[PDB]
Amino acid sequence: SYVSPLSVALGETARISCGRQALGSRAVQWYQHKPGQAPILLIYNNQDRPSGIPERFSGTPDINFGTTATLTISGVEVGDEADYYCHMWDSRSGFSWSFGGATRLTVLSQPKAAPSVTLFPPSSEELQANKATLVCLISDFYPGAVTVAWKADSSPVKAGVETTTPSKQSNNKYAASSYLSLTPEQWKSHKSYSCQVTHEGSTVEKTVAPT
Amino acid sequence: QVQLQESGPGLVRPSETLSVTCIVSGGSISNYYWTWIRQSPGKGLEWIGYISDRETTTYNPSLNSRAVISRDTSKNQLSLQLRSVTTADTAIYFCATARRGQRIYGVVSFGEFFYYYYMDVWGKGTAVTVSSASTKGPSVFPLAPSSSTSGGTAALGCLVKDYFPEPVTVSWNSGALTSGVHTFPAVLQSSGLYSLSSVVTVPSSSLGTQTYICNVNHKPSNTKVDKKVEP
Amino acid sequence: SVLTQSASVSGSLGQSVTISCTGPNSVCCSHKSISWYQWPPGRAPTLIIYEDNERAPGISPRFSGYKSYWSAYLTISDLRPEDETTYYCCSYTHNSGCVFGTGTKVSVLGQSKANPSVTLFPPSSEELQANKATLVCLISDFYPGAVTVAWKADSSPVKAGVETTTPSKQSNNKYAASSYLSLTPEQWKSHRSYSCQVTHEGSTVEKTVAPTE
Amino acid sequence: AVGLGAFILGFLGAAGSTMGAASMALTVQARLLLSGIVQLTVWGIKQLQARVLAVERYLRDQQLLGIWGCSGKIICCTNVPWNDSWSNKTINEIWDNMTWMQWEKEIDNYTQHIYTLLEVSQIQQEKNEQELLELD
Amino acid sequence: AKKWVTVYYGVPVWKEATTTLFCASDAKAYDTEVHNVWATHACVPTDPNPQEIVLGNVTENFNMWKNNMVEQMHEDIISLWDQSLKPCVKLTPLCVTLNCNNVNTNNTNTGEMKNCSFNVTTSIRDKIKKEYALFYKLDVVPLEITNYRLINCNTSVITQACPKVSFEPIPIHYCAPAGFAILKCNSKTFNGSGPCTNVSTVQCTHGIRPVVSTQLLLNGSLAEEEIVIRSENITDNAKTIIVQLNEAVEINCTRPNNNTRKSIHIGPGRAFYATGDIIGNIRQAHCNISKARWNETLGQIVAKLEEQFPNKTIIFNHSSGGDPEIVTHSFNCGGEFFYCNTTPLFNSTWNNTYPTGGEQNITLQCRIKQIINMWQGVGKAMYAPPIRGQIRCSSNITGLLLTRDGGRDQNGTETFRPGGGNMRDNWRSELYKYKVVKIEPLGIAPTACKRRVVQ
Amino acid sequence: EGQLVQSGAELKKPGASVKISCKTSGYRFNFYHINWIRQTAGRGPEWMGWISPYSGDKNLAPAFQDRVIMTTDTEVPVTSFTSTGAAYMEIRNLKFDDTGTYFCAKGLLRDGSSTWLPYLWGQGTLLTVSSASTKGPSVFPLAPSSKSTSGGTAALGCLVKDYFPEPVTVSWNSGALTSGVHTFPAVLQSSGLYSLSSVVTVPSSSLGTQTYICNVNHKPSNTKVDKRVEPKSCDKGLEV
Ligand SMILES: *[C@@H]1O[C@H](CO)[C@@H](O[C@@H]2O[C@H](CO)[C@@H](O[C@@H]3O[C@H](CO[C@H]4O[C@H](CO[C@H]5O[C@H](CO)[C@@H](O)[C@H](O)[C@@H]5O)[C@@H](O)[C@H](O)[C@@H]4O[C@H]4O[C@H](CO)[C@@H](O)[C@H](O)[C@@H]4O)[C@@H](O)[C@H](O[C@H]4O[C@H](CO)[C@@H](O)[C@H](O)[C@@H]4O)[C@@H]3O)[C@H](O)[C@H]2NC(C)=O)[C@H](O)[C@H]1NC(C)=O
Ligand SMILES: *[C@@H]1O[C@H](CO)[C@@H](O[C@@H]2O[C@H](CO)[C@@H](O[C@@H]3O[C@H](CO[C@H]4O[C@H](CO)[C@@H](O)[C@H](O)[C@@H]4O)[C@@H](O)[C@H](O[C@H]4O[C@H](CO)[C@@H](O)[C@H](O)[C@@H]4O)[C@@H]3O)[C@H](O)[C@H]2NC(C)=O)[C@H](O)[C@H]1NC(C)=O
Ligand SMILES: *[C@@H]1O[C@H](CO)[C@@H](O[C@@H]2O[C@H](CO)[C@@H](O[C@@H]3O[C@H](CO[C@H]4O[C@H](CO)[C@@H](O)[C@H](O)[C@@H]4O)[C@@H](O)[C@H](O[C@H]4O[C@H](CO)[C@@H](O)[C@H](O)[C@@H]4O)[C@@H]3O)[C@H](O)[C@H]2NC(C)=O)[C@H](O)[C@H]1NC(C)=O
Ligand SMILES: *[C@@H]1O[C@H](CO)[C@@H](O[C@@H]2O[C@H](CO)[C@@H](O[C@@H]3O[C@H](CO)[C@@H](O)[C@H](O[C@H]4O[C@H](CO)[C@@H](O)[C@H](O)[C@@H]4O)[C@@H]3O)[C@H](O)[C@H]2NC(C)=O)[C@H](O)[C@H]1NC(C)=O
Ligand SMILES: *[C@@H]1O[C@H](CO)[C@@H](O[C@@H]2O[C@H](CO)[C@@H](O[C@@H]3O[C@H](CO)[C@@H](O)[C@H](O)[C@@H]3O)[C@H](O)[C@H]2NC(C)=O)[C@H](O)[C@H]1NC(C)=O
Ligand SMILES: *[C@@H]1O[C@H](CO)[C@@H](O[C@@H]2O[C@H](CO)[C@@H](O[C@@H]3O[C@H](CO)[C@@H](O)[C@H](O)[C@@H]3O)[C@H](O)[C@H]2NC(C)=O)[C@H](O)[C@H]1NC(C)=O
Ligand SMILES: *[C@@H]1O[C@H](CO)[C@@H](O[C@@H]2O[C@H](CO)[C@@H](O[C@@H]3O[C@H](CO)[C@@H](O)[C@H](O)[C@@H]3O)[C@H](O)[C@H]2NC(C)=O)[C@H](O)[C@H]1NC(C)=O
Ligand SMILES: *[C@@H]1O[C@H](CO)[C@@H](O[C@@H]2O[C@H](CO)[C@@H](O[C@@H]3O[C@H](CO)[C@@H](O)[C@H](O)[C@@H]3O)[C@H](O)[C@H]2NC(C)=O)[C@H](O)[C@H]1NC(C)=O
Ligand SMILES: *[C@@H]1O[C@H](CO)[C@@H](O[C@@H]2O[C@H](CO)[C@@H](O)[C@H](O)[C@H]2NC(C)=O)[C@H](O)[C@H]1NC(C)=O
Ligand SMILES: *[C@@H]1O[C@H](CO)[C@@H](O)[C@H](O)[C@H]1NC(C)=O
Ligand SMILES: *[C@@H]1O[C@H](CO)[C@@H](O)[C@H](O)[C@H]1NC(C)=O
Ligand SMILES: *[C@@H]1O[C@H](CO)[C@@H](O)[C@H](O)[C@H]1NC(C)=O
Numbered sequence A: 001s002y003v004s005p006l007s008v009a010l011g012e013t014a015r016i017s018c019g020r021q022a023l024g025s026r027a028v029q030w031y032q033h034k035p036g037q038a039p040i041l042l043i044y045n046n047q048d049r050p051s052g053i054p055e056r057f058s059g060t061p062d063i064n065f066g067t068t069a070t071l072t073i074s075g076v077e078v079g080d081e082a083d084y085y086c087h088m089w090d091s092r093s094g095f096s097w098s099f100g101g102a103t104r105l106t107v108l109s110q111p112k113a114a115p116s117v118t119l120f121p122p123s124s125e126e127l128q129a130n131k132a133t134l135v136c137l138i139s140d141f142y143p144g145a146v147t148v149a150w151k152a153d154s155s156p157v158k159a160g161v162e163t164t165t166p167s168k169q170s171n172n173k174y175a176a177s178s179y180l181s182l183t184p185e186q187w188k189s190h191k192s193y194s195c196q197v198t199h200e201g202s203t204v205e206k207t208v209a210p211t
Numbered sequence B: 001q002v003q004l005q006e007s008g009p010g011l012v013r014p015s016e017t018l019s020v021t022c023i024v025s026g027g028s029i030s031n032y033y034w035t036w037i038r039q040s041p042g043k044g045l046e047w048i049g050y051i052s053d054r055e056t057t058t059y060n061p062s063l064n065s066r067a068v069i070s071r072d073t074s075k076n077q078l079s080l081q082l083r084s085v086t087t088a089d090t091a092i093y094f095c096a097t098a099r100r101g102q103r104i105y106g107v108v109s110f111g112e113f114f115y116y117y118y119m120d121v122w123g124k125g126t127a128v129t130v131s132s133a134s135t136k137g138p139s140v141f142p143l144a145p146s147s148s149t150s151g152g153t154a155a156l157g158c159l160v161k162d163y164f165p166e167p168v169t170v171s172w173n174s175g176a177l178t179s180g181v182h183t184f185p186a187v188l189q190s191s192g193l194y195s196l197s198s199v200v201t202v203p204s205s206s207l208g209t210q211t212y213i214c215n216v217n218h219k220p221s222n223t224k225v226d227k228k229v230e231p
Numbered sequence C: 001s002v003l004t005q006s007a008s009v010s011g012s013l014g015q016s017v018t019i020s021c022t023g024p025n026s027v028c029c030s031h032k033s034i035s036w037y038q039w040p041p042g043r044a045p046t047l048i049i050y051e052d053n054e055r056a057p058g059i060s061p062r063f064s065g066y067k068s069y070w071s072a073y074l075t076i077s078d079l080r081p082e083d084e085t086t087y088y089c090c091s092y093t094h095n096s097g098c099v100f101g102t103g104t105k106v107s108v109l110g111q112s113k114a115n116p117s118v119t120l121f122p123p124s125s126e127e128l129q130a131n132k133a134t135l136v137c138l139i140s141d142f143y144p145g146a147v148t149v150a151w152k153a154d155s156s157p158v159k160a161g162v163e164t165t166t167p168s169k170q171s172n173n174k175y176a177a178s179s180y181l182s183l184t185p186e187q188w189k190s191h192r193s194y195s196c197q198v199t200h201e202g203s204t205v206e207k208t209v210a211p212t213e
Numbered sequence D: 001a002v003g004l005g006a007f008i009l010g011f012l013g014a015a016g017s018t019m020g021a022a023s024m025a026l027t028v029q030a031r032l033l034l035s036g037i038v039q040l041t042v043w044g045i046k047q048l049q050a051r052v053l054a055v056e057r058y059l060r061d062q063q064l065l066g067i068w069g070c071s072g073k074i075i076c077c078t079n080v081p082w083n084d085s086w087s088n089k090t091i092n093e094i095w096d097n098m099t100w101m102q103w104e105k106e107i108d109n110y111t112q113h114i115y116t117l118l119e120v121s122q123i124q125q126e127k128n129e130q131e132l133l134e135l136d
Numbered sequence E: 001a002k003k004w005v006t007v008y009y010g011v012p013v014w015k016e017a018t019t020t021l022f023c024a025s026d027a028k029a030y031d032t033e034v035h036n037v038w039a040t041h042a043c044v045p046t047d048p049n050p051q052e053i054v055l056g057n058v059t060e061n062f063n064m065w066k067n068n069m070v071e072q073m074h075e076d077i078i079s080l081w082d083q084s085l086k087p088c089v090k091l092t093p094l095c096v097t098l099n100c101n102n103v104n105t106n107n108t109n110t111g112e113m114k115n116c117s118f119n120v121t122t123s124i125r126d127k128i129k130k131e132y133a134l135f136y137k138l139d140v141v142p143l144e145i146t147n148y149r150l151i152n153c154n155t156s157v158i159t160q161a162c163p164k165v166s167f168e169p170i171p172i173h174y175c176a177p178a179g180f181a182i183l184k185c186n187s188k189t190f191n192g193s194g195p196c197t198n199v200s201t202v203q204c205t206h207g208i209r210p211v212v213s214t215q216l217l218l219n220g221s222l223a224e225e226e227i228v229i230r231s232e233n234i235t236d237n238a239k240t241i242i243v244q245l246n247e248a249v250e251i252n253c254t255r256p257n258n259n260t261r262k263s264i265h266i267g268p269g270r271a272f273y274a275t276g277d278i279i280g281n282i283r284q285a286h287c288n289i290s291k292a293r294w295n296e297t298l299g300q301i302v303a304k305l306e307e308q309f310p311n312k313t314i315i316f317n318h319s320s321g322g323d324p325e326i327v328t329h330s331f332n333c334g335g336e337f338f339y340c341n342t343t344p345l346f347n348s349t350w351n352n353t354y355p356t357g358g359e360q361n362i363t364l365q366c367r368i369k370q371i372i373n374m375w376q377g378v379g380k381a382m383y384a385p386p387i388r389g390q391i392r393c394s395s396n397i398t399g400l401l402l403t404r405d406g407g408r409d410q411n412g413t414e415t416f417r418p419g420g421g422n423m424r425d426n427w428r429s430e431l432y433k434y435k436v437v438k439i440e441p442l443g444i445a446p447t448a449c450k451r452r453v454v455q
Numbered sequence F: 001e002g003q004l005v006q007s008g009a010e011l012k013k014p015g016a017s018v019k020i021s022c023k024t025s026g027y028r029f030n031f032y033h034i035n036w037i038r039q040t041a042g043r044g045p046e047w048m049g050w051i052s053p054y055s056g057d058k059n060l061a062p063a064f065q066d067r068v069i070m071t072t073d074t075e076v077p078v079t080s081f082t083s084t085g086a087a088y089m090e091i092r093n094l095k096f097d098d099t100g101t102y103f104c105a106k107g108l109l110r111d112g113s114s115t116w117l118p119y120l121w122g123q124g125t126l127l128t129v130s131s132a133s134t135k136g137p138s139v140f141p142l143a144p145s146s147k148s149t150s151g152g153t154a155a156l157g158c159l160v161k162d163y164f165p166e167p168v169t170v171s172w173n174s175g176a177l178t179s180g181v182h183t184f185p186a187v188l189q190s191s192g193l194y195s196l197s198s199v200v201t202v203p204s205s206s207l208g209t210q211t212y213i214c215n216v217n218h219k220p221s222n223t224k225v226d227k228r229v230e231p232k233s234c235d236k237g238l239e240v
């Protein structure tokens, strides 16, 4: 159905259990998938890894029946955090079409990064089109749990607010952006507009004003 | 040494025949196996079907009804076609080069061996959406530099207004500038359209004569828009 | 042979006869057994007496044995025509092979006379073709022993090419003999007749063939 | 020839040898003629009936040797003459050219008759005269 | 010079007669004492030292086909079996009908072990349970919901052999009672029936294992030098051919399925044992025979078959004319009764005496049952309780059983069929050398010895 | 009550070797010794030796201890008390005085003081030692001759001439005519060749109902002669 979460400390080795365990001799594949990217398999035969895969990953061969197919990851770092699928191929079951239940690996006690908030006023050409939108961009924050509150003068906006759910980038930090749709007359009315981004206990505020 | 390239419409009306193409440059199609894997949001990966090197199909029993897979001999490309699609069929489509193994737990003559497959090579993956709604081309509004941080670091960028076709590509100076680029993910507004932003961090000394131009290409709208950004 | 028997002996019909068997003390009788055999010439013998006196199985009680410290004896009682043959004794121990004797030929007297049958054959025409000529005089069924044969060419004796066989005993306890006269066809054709003269001690028989017929 | 207690010919050690040869060692087939001396299953009734058959056949011979004046002895001579109608061979032919086997096969015709003659003409007559002679 | 009768006690005189022989089996003493059916230790232990007495100058005629020792051993096995089934559980209330599903298995391109579910009245008579079990296909036949019943329920009753008794053969010795003795042949190439040159006598026969088997024989006595082909009538096709091996060829049979044992209460104090859910890979029981060793053994058998037969000779064909129990090589190992397909074992074609690159180990598949009517014994069947864990065994094959085709009135050369015409022939394969006789120790004889005059 | 049958007569050259066989039947071949006894004209009957088929032991006379090699075969069982066997005797360095008749003989008793004493004897094997070569005979017909005019009997036969190997065999009508046959011994010519005659006495009236054929076999030369005796006789006494 859905994904199974897993939490591991940084640098400490880890193991990932496999659902629907085999009933006989089995050949399991372990796929490492990151959202939006191409899935990479680490272990095609339970003990064999293709060229390029690092030696930190390893799988449990089935020399004697009864062993459980787990995926061991030594030296857990930022890059290992992804979704892991366990393909199953036993002798008792028929054609195994589906992949195993996804396993959400999360690396713990990873240092938190302060977000880099960037607020942009609506362009002059956008005002000519009789529209106005405020772009508040958040970058390079690790704990993906930011709450974006908007402020017109000392008043919260609360309306026309659209915000993305945080998404990881290449730096393994998350990235989120908030959009505030306004009318060009309301933008010209107030003195200044503020974007408040609360990250963990902290809160950063950027303010922009019309020319 | 094998490269896969997925190409397709990326947007199909419901209850219509989706099509796609998987271009291979590494070797011949008649030597290895191929398969198709889609990625729907909120759900895990799904294996829909595979084709052999002697051209023999085999489909997932749940999609068995509406899927047909073929491979071309002249062109190293394998085509996928799905009939009566719905907006659940909307997903990131991966073609992968599969190869075969033989697991034997006993004597070969009395059966006792089962075939297992695994895809060692994957393509980049193409996105396909399914919705009755029409195509909406994006309009580009430049984000002027605030003139931002000490030490000379300043930021500008380009705003891409609301569009429904989800995949959008953004470059800068036709791919001449790569440092400081950070294209953020699009937001699905209540309007039913997506909107993204692309910023570039550059020093203030070169912020005057930069001649920075962002290039916003877009495929479903068939429109390529270039916008100049100046203070 | 060092084991000496009587060279000959004779007895009357229905009477008894004794044969001797003696030699040196190296073949002495005290420490060795004596066995007797009936050995007709030209046939296989038959054991009549083994380990001295005891007789072989099937032997009639007419035969009896006796062994003294210096010699052994074999007494044949109630003589029959078939008892007229040759006999040998044997000296042996348990692990030493047999030593045969010199031999003894028994003659039964008080016998009935049998008239001789004489038959003379001329040489065949196929034999005269190859330049050879042989006369065959066959004699059979004479109980009296030792026959004499004489050949004659035109009532005159012949001496070249005469071959006479020894007397042989017939299955009917009678006797038989034969004689052959080898000649050249000139001698055969230049004579009026040839004759085979068989002479016994009681009567002489003559048979004559003629080349003319 | 003669073994002085180490011949180990054994049970039926000389059944292919001459009658005079095997006759010298007849205590071997005498002790070993009753060797069975040294739970409802089939092996119980098959064994208990095999034991009682062995004891019953042994007691048949000693029964006959008892009505023959021979109970104690293995070899025992008699007083009934040997009619030549039974066999016509010599004492050198029987005991030095025949085995007990082919010999018994020649006199098997007349055995039951000899077994009668043996017990009436002797031992029965002897005990009657042994009673009369010792009376005075 | 006068002859008088002299009676002798102890004469070497024997006669051929029949007696009720008994058993001899060495002592097996252990704390984990498991009683044995085929050779119960109720019979007297064998002597610590065998005593064989050679009989010089003896020429005795042996006939293995007229031997009464076979007819008795065959009757001893039958009665020994029933005594072990009487005190064990009989499956009479288990004739209730069964709804059965085929075993879970991926079809590579059917299933025989199967699965079934049925009712069972508990130890209490009014309560009713419902459980599952796994019964091989040959043991059950359908009546129409794919309802099923046991193969024997319309025929006769069935009794489950106790799990304490073991189905392994241990050497048995046949002793003749006192006053008798057994005569044994020793000729290296002793024709079936005829005169044995150099004979001996023994009280108890050698260690013979009572192995119930079909077609090829196992754990027998190996004759020396060249092999031998003993037949009652080599000219009559209806007469069974018994064959003997000189070198021991080995057979390797296993049942790879790692089954389990479920104890069901079908009655008060009566625990019916049955196969639990299978564990591990699904597999079939096979038997392995090195072809390099069977090729030489086959090449020697045709030579002795080319001696009893003309110079123009060919080879054999297999297994037609009876029930599927006769068709397969049936035996026992560990406890389960196998029934192997002997098609690949006799596959060849020789002329004046098969594949050159054929695989190393000949491998035959063996269907397993659990309801058996052996020795053609109609009536109360026997249920072999399932064996825990994996089964592995290895035996030596020492003999075969063939049968001529039977040409109608003319012969296109000649073919042979492996056939077990009778269960008794498994005892003739080891009771050919033995024969029973009775001792007649009474011998009248004439001597010059007249007992003392009556005085 | 058994029969001993020895091998046929052989002709060897002096200095060569010869091996004689003696096949037995009708008794346990392992129970009795096999004696070998020869008889020549110069020394009379001479005992050579005996051999045991059961133990393999042999005793040879010192006169033959250096030239006789005796061997036996293994008995072939027939019944429980009878069998068939074969004994061999090999003599080397043949001389002219060795020419004579050779016998094999069954033993007497199984035990006792005379266990080997020759008791049952074979038919004897004729051995001739000569440097001359084999010569076949020439058969001539003997015309019928009168035997009794009043009795009505006649005599006819066949003549054998100039055959070197001594053995002689004559039969009549392929063995169907055995009554009245009278075969005469051979003559020793001064040349070394032998010759004899055979005559049969038949009624004179038997001329149109019976066929008379004399069959002469000379096996050393491997020659068979079947001569038809012409029944027309020259005797005036028989013509009457
Ligand atoms: C099955 O049936 C067969 C019948 O065929 C039985 O064989 C017979 O056995 C009996 C009893 O043993 C024999 O009776 C004896 O025969 C003796 C003659 O042979 C023995 O001794 C001679 C001596 O050998 C030397 O001198 C020879 C001079 O002739 C010379 O030739 C030789 O080379 C030697 O230099 C042996 O030649 C002979 O083989 C045999 O025994 C010897 O050999 C055997 C086997 O090789 C060996 O195992 C022995 O150890 C031994 O070396 C004769 O001497 C003897 O008489 C004396 O003793 C008896 C005792 O009974 C006494 O009564 C008598 O007064 C003398 O003192 C006695 O006659 C019989 O010949 C055998 N017959 C045949 C045909 O073989 C066999 O035993 C039987 N088997 C069983 C198990 O029962
Ligand atoms: C392997 O085993 C077989 C047995 O299956 C042995 O077979 C022997 O075959 C011979 C063939 O000749 C049998 O001889 C036959 O005997 C019949 C009667 O038996 C009595 O007489 C014999 C004499 O030999 C005794 O042995 C036996 O105990 C009986 O007292 C005769 O009637 C037969 O002759 C008749 O038929 C033949 C043709 O078949 C005619 O020519 C005759 O005129 C007559 O009509 C015949 O003689 C013998 O009985 C069988 N058993 C033996 C010898 O023990 C094989 O010999 C054996 N082979 C080996 C190597 O061991
Ligand atoms: C009498 O009965 C016996 C018992 O079965 C038969 O013996 C078997 O015969 C079969 C053929 O009928 C043999 O099977 C063959 O196996 C070959 C494999 O050997 C190659 O590959 C192995 C590794 O797997 C290498 O070690 C080896 O060196 C070789 O390179 C196959 O190549 C054969 O293929 C044929 O059949 C297949 C399937 O049908 C086809 O797809 C192929 O095109 C080709 O036609 C074949 O499968 C088997 O090995 C033999 N058994 C043993 C124990 O060796 C006798 O053949 C049979 N005789 C008769 C019927 O006359
Ligand atoms: C065939 O099928 C049988 C099932 O019938 C199967 O036997 C099972 O094996 C497992 C092992 O994987 C057993 O589980 C054991 O349970 C016992 C209970 O006491 C434990 O003690 C065992 O662990 C001990 O041994 C370890 C060995 O290193 C120790 O390190 C540990 O500290 C313990 O001392 C273990 O958990 C299970 O009980 C049996 N089931 C039975 C016997 O019914 C067998 O493995 C299968 N074999 C094949 C080849 O398929
Ligand atoms: C006669 O039949 C007998 C009966 O068995 C055969 O005798 C057996 O021969 C073998 C030969 O290898 C003997 O084996 C060896 O015996 C010796 C002595 O005991 C022993 O030390 C070895 O360990 C081995 O067992 C065997 O003993 C013997 N059997 C008996 C009962 O004596 C024999 O082959 C046949 N042949 C002849 C010619 O007699
Ligand atoms: C069936 O074939 C097997 C082949 O393995 C035969 O096995 C043999 O058995 C004997 C008796 O146990 C072994 O002899 C013993 O070996 C042990 C272990 O080394 C040793 O300690 C003893 O002193 C004795 O020598 C023999 O080694 C073994 N064969 C091999 C090759 O090892 C078995 O006899 C055959 N059975 C039949 C009925 O043919
Ligand atoms: C049936 O099973 C038996 C036993 O399980 C197999 O017998 C085995 O055969 C091989 C043949 O070489 C033996 O190998 C031996 O190795 C030893 C040690 O290195 C070496 O000294 C010998 O010379 C020989 O090479 C092996 O010992 C033997 N037994 C066992 C217990 O392994 C047989 O191959 C099987 N037959 C089939 C499956 O047809
Ligand atoms: C040995 O293997 C051969 C393999 O061919 C077997 O030959 C087959 O024998 C069966 C016997 O029923 C033949 O069936 C036929 O049925 C028709 C039905 O009308 C009938 O008219 C015929 O008389 C015959 O019974 C079958 O045709 C024949 N094979 C072929 C290819 O024709 C043979 O039976 C095997 N022998 C043994 C002892 O297993
Ligand atoms: C044999 O059939 C029985 C009856 O259908 C099976 O028993 C059920 O097995 C499932 C597992 O798939 C359990 O969840 C149920 O609880 C079982 N039912 C009962 C009443 O116990 C059994 O699994 C089958 N065995 C095999 C090997 O397929
Ligand atoms: C022997 O038995 C025969 C036959 O019964 C009989 O006629 C004869 O009188 C008997 N002789 C003696 C001495 O018993
Ligand atoms: C029995 O003995 C007498 C007396 O010598 C004899 O005439 C007869 O032939 C013998 N019979 C047998 C069968 O031995
Ligand atoms: C007695 O034995 C002889 C010889 O074997 C036989 O002729 C006769 O029939 C036998 N008599 C009886 C009554 O058995």
Ligand SMILES: *[C@@H]1O[C@H](CO)[C@@H](O)[C@H](O)[C@H]1NC(C)=O
Binding pocket: E097, E098, E099, E117, E118, E119, E128, E129, E130
């Ligand atoms: C008995 O079993 C049958 C199927 O085997 C089932 O349909 C029925 O309900 C059962 N009855 C009970 C458990 O009372």
Ligand SMILES: *[C@@H]1O[C@H](CO)[C@@H](O)[C@H](O)[C@H]1NC(C)=O
Binding pocket: E232, E233, E235, E236
């Ligand atoms: C074997 O069978 C044939 C044919 O039926 C028959 O002629 C012969 O006598 C039989 N021989 C034996 C020993 O059974």
Ligand SMILES: *[C@@H]1O[C@H](CO)[C@@H](O)[C@H](O)[C@H]1NC(C)=O
Binding pocket: E311, E312
């Ligand atoms: C072999 O048997 C065939 C049968 O066709 C025959 O032609 C040939 O003569 C036989 N040869 C020998 C040596 O037996």
Ligand SMILES: *[C@@H]1O[C@H](CO)[C@@H](O)[C@H](O)[C@H]1NC(C)=O
Binding pocket: E311, E312, E313, E351, E352
């Ligand atoms: C079979 O053998 C016979 C006799 O040896 C021979 O004549 C024939 O040619 C052979 N045929 C084949 C196909 O081998």
Ligand SMILES: *[C@@H]1O[C@H](CO)[C@@H](O)[C@H](O)[C@H]1NC(C)=O
Binding pocket: E291, E292, E295, E296, E299, E354, E355, E356, E357, E358
């Ligand atoms: C079996 O033996 C025969 C004859 O020795 C030979 O021709 C054949 O190739 C052998 N086959 C195998 C598989 O060893």
